[PDB]
Point group: D2
Chain length 310, copies 4
């Protein structure tokens, strides 16, 4: 029967706060029917699989378990959250040894699905994942600025008192210090922020600048206050997972392979893209202001120098 | 890529009030990613496909269209609602000529999924569908008493003022005049109706009898009041569709093939069963009282005489 | 207890294909906890209440019943759906007057019940009967709401979505004006993931200007096409009504295209007309004034002008 | 406007792994519209409010913030989570007394705020602190609710589900008593699609009586196992709390196993203990008295008796 393939399977690599939260999000929202959890700490994963399974009588069912790389053989989706924290080039090299020890055995399993990469530094490790896996460009995807974008929208939403789902604004570039806001195209119900400020002059230019600074530095603030950041990215990863598994052709800001867009080549970087069951379908090229295009070039340039050196 | 198969496709046969409502239910609940609508009246289906597509910006996306039997080639699910209304043997023979004109071209398409049958008379046309299609027993499924059961639960729920999802009661047998309630196992939060009546003697025995009579005759009442019945069965069909497509192993009352259960053989009849992506996994055999087992035998016997004659 | 108020109640007026389908949408999505159905045809509503109730064991619970205007006393929401349709003899003014007699016979008893909630109007012609509902009810402007161009907007987005092969939730485009023949598309602000249709066409010159014009014409005329093919249109508006209902009942501050009262916006006054607006538990919070091109602003002025002449003539 | 009340507000007390996870569950499932987070550690709550807010553009909106007891004034729901844990030196009575000082310092200011909603208690030891919360708050019995054996019950169902390979939503089995070492399974009424486990074992004699005993032991001891493997347990109870929260806020009349006040049921009095009960916007509506076997009724009596001795000793 053809319907024997109506069983969706995710392998999660990394059972820290991000991965564990991701899994919980998938459980509550009933996305996928199987989650295998892989981590160096086998006892932690066993415990989490049980704790997560305890939730299932209140949601749709799932097979959940402590897993091994070899369980990726027939998986739809491999989600990588296992990122060693911090020179930048040292950080990269350290995470490359670890990433290779994950990707190689996964490929050897026979895995033939989509890689979703969230480990920091995400754009770089997305490129590294593509390079190591030998998979096509469109089937290796990074979370990129999906979270920064969410943070940006929520910030705007709170300022104007509107549901964030009605706010449309991007953060683009390499996720990190060099990312930038696309104010030229940011809007609320089609009314741009430039037009919004006209109609509501209480909103000072300097508020908007600070708003983006707060977004860019949001991880530092959250870590300072509570030790770690995880609910945002977990929620984003589940959103991306759903777009793939329900074949949505949704537009999301993701780390995607650059083949000419924005005058860039041979890096993964953050931009809006269309995604479905087969991964990336279209890379959307927002036409940026000169100011904005300069930010993109700088972000890309610095990123590319590090990859080449790496 | 393996994820190229994360696209779920339903072909609906019959675009009357039942089928149209089913489709709407699937749209709102975001179940499946494609619905092809097939009916003799091509203009009606074209119109419905458009009207249903107009809803999609408020839900998850779907490809929806007026379709042909040949579009079942790669479908997960074929839902048959096309039932000519009313001797009983005449009714059957009439619906068999029509059913054959549907099933044969669907099989010829290469369809290799699950048949879900709702056309009346459902248990008989479920058997006929199995016989005509040549598919395995567990991949031809009828809606059976899923709707009668829902009606029963809601009736009880209203009487005791409790959420129907907390009421557990079955109607079994052949869907129609000979179906019967399983009071022996019916309960609310594990407290049986027999035990409930003990604790709440306001509930008269004669109320319960009438309650089941009202259930058995519910279609006649609804038709008399508003011309047709459709929201219940559409909702049930969508529930069954979800159990299959999300591989739930849910327990539902369905028309399933009898291989010894209740001392019955070689008919489709209504009983609780476990269902998932591969259709029927287990037929549950409720142990009935003598009174209840007699009702099952009679229901089955009459049904079997009609099939044999047919 | 304060939580005694955590029970949401909708009174639906009109149990035709729109109202019935609305109710079904509310049932499946679990939106309020009580739906009373009111219509001249009491048997129909009794039958629908039962048929809808049959769905409840698969969804969250609800009290559903055939209802009377007096049941609006403590309702959150009154949804009005069944406009008397235009007969081939009649003028637009005739259609309005006919529907005003009927509308009054609904709104007055509802107000007399003590109802103190929000009116959601979908009956055609919607912008006019939204105004009439405000005028008859005496309620505040922001607590009388029409569905306006929410459906036309959905149709527009889905059309674009299909052309570019993208999830319509990722397409952001409005139809504005009076819902009907004089409505118009806001191409200047329409976009897909922030890339405008003007910018999209630059990158994809296969997309001919004429395709876009026709695409909007097909949207404007969509009801005629659907009615011709299957007799009636209902799934789109029912779904929209349920979406608006959810924005109110879950206090969302969602931006939707709705028929809202005009107090200067677009250089218009004292009509209800279609534009994006922010809506929550208290009804309309902000009317968004999209800054239009000259061409687009002209369409809005014409739509408004014709609408206003009819209202003025109607109430005299 | 009456719809000004269509804004649901939860105050969470305790921002440990349970409370935080609860809040996240409420966010993802779109349950109330406002969550105020209260904890001795103000920086933690500020950070969580932000981190949770980051999720909102993917879900329905919510106002989320670091909060104070006085923010309970107009709350629907107060959820209490962070019991001070038992130190290796201390008696059960010591644990209770310690948690009573703390609980009082929470409940009194909440009551003083004007809060007039429902208390949902999850702090361990839950049945006792549910009673203490009732006693301290002065609220009615049916508006103070503990999570009781809702989680143990979930664990039990999932265990059975896994053994028989069936969706746990199709498994109907309770754990009852005081949540903890003295709780017990109700095999007599446990079933899968109406077929009892006694009847299931008849049809499937592979299933050994000893497997079932161990299955319950594993459930009873599940917290110890999970804590041993990963340090803490939280996803199960958070999910349960969100389920109970939804039953209240959507006025469901759902049947759940909860810690409820005993007024004769099972021949018990004046304790909170775990049994199925019907719950809606006004809290507890019916306590369901499952008729137990002699063996099962004995377990309930023992569980209750030990619990009652501790409460009596505690309040003197
Ligand atoms: O993906 P984008 O460009 O931000 O748009 C996503 C959002 O669009 C929406 O459809 C609403 O936006 P608009 O209503 O202005 O079109 C939501 O469904 C969704 O959360
Ligand atoms: O399929 P059955 O036998 O009626 O049970 C289905 C129902 O069981 C439930 O889990 C609740 O029933 P209980 O809470 O008594 O176990 C619901 O999730 C679901 O609607």
């Amino acid at each position: 029967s053809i319907t024997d393939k109506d069983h969706q399977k995710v392998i999660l690599v990394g059972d820290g706060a991000v991965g564990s939260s991701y899994a919980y999000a998938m459980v509550l929202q009933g996305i996928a029917q199987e989650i295998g959890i892989v981590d160096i700490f086998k006892d932690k994963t066993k415990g989490d699989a049980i704790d997560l399974s305890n939730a299932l009588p209140f949601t749709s069912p799932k097979k959940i378990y402590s897993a091994e790389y070899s369980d990726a053989k027939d998986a739809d989706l491999v989600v990588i959250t296992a990122g060693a924290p911090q020179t930048r080039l040292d950080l990269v090299n350290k995470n490359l040894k670890i990433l290779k020890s994950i990707v190689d055995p996964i490929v050897d399993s026979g895995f033939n699905g989509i890689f979703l990469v969230a480990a920091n530094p995400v754009d770089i490790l997305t490129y590294a994942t593509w390079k190591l896996s030998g998979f096509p460009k469109n089937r290796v995807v990074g979370s990129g600025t999906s979270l920064d974008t969410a943070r940006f929208r929520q910030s705007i939403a709170e300022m104007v008192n509107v549901d964030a789902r009605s706010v449309h604004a991007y953060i683009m570039g390499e996720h990190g210090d060099t990312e930038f806001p696309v104010w030229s195209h940011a809007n609320i119900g089609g009314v741009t922020i430039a037009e919004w400020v006209k109609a509501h002059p209480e909103i000072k230019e300097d508020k908007l600048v600070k708003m983006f600074e707060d977004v860019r530095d949001a991880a530092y603030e959250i870590i300072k206050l509570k030790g770690a950041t995880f609910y945002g990215i977990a929620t984003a990863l589940a959103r991306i997972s759903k777009a793939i598994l329900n074949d949505e052709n949704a537009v999301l800001p993701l780390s995607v392979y650059m083949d000419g867009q924005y005058g860039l080549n041979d890096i993964y970087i953050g931009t809006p893209a269309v995604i479905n069951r087969n991964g990336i379908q279209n890379i959307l090229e927002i036409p940026l202001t000169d100011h904005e295009e300069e930010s993109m070039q700088k972000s890309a340039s610095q990123l590319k120098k590090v990859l080449t050196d790496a």
